């Protein structure tokens, strides 16, 4: 019964911002000491009681998410924090209880060119509801004229990507993100991390 976080940051095909991935961490336990304290991370925004004590408490259930984000775009990585992400890609749960273990991998998850490994959202009916995703590639209908499902004036393909490459500056540099909803449910509560 050993489930390392390896499998998550080893997901070298890190999912796109909107098209994040999941792993229902349940009925498993593993020790995450070195990569949580001795980690080379940056902007360890992990909420909860603290960055620690999670490797000391059992978990009700744990859910994993991966984001591939522009460098300082982290500003928008918070529920109720507005921006061109919450409006379009992932407005975090208004009362987000899980946490964030994001950090810059300029080498990892980016290579020279217009990297095709990540995509995000630009145009929507309205602000995306918290804690969900959009798969749609339907065009951006908002207003008077119809557009018969082709891109054009006031109807654009809503998923444009900043396919950056490692050469950028920190704000435009690559940034891995992972979001870990340590959610809390009833009698089935089968995760621990000592």
């Amino acid at each position, epitope marked *: 019964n050993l489930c390392p976080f390896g499998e998550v940051f080893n997901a070298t095909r890190f999912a796109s911002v909107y098209a994040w991935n999941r792993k229902r961490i349940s009925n498993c336990v593993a020790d995450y000491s070195v990569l949580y304290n001795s980690a080379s991370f940056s902007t360890f925004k992990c909420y909860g009681v603290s960055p620690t004590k999670l490797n000391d408490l059992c978990f009700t259930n744990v859910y994993a998410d991966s984001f591939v984000i522009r460098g300082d775009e982290v500003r928008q990585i918070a529920p109720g924090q507005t921006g061109k992400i919450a409006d379009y890609n992932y407005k975090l749960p208004d009362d987000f209880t899980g946490c964030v273990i994001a950090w810059n991998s300029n080498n990892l998850d980016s290579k020279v060119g217009g990297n095709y490994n990540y995509l995000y959202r630009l*145009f929507r009916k309205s602000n995306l509801k918290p804690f969900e995703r959009d798969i749609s590639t339907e065009i951006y209908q908002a207003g008077s004229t*119809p557009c018969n499902g*082709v891109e*054009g*004036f006031n109807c654009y393909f809503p998923l444009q990507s900043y396919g950056f490459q490692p050469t950028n500056g920190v704000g435009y540099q690559p940034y891995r993100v992972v979001v870990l909803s340590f959610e809390l449910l009833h009698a089935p509560a089968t995760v621990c991390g000592p």
Partner: antibody
Amino acid sequence: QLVQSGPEVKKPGTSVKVSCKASGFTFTSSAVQWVRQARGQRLEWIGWIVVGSGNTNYAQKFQERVTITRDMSTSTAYMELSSLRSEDTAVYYCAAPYCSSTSCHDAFDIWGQGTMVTVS
Amino acid sequence: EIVLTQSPGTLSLSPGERATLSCRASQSVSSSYLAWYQQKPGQAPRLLIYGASSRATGIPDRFSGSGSGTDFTLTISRLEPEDFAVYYCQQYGSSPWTFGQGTKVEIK
């Protein structure tokens, strides 16, 4: 309304940027197009760029001979071109549909004073 | 696509205008995404009609147009003979958005 930047006098050979400023209507709810004219000329197109995206469009006349840019902080729009020609003198009109955050019109109605873009 | 057409060239008229202006192309293209604009001696090219049968919240009454698809038309049924400017057609639709030949209106 709209206020284009000042009448900009650049060299007949140069690389030129141009700036436009809004009023009421917000770029990040619409797109902005660039077109050219002079005193009597056919009102000729350049291109247009979404504001949400960097997606810009233009004839085969501008594949490498064009560059547009936006400002989500100042909400000032810009174009530029590198290694233009003396023929490229014109009153560079930028226009954009009246849009206020899902309150949009479908018409390139709003045409500023016009930067006299003068390659001289 | 590029070769648009506007038959009336430089129409010549006088006060008491029931004039009209029509737009064709070298190609059959969309209908919901084409417009006519008004340009005076030294003014910003103002908006007249976006789409054949259409108007804005402020564009003047007695102002209209029709047609679709293949061919387009406009008119201003009555008018105070104040200003007689150039009128510009422009499809945008699908790329590349482009502008028309431009037809003038004057007074004898």
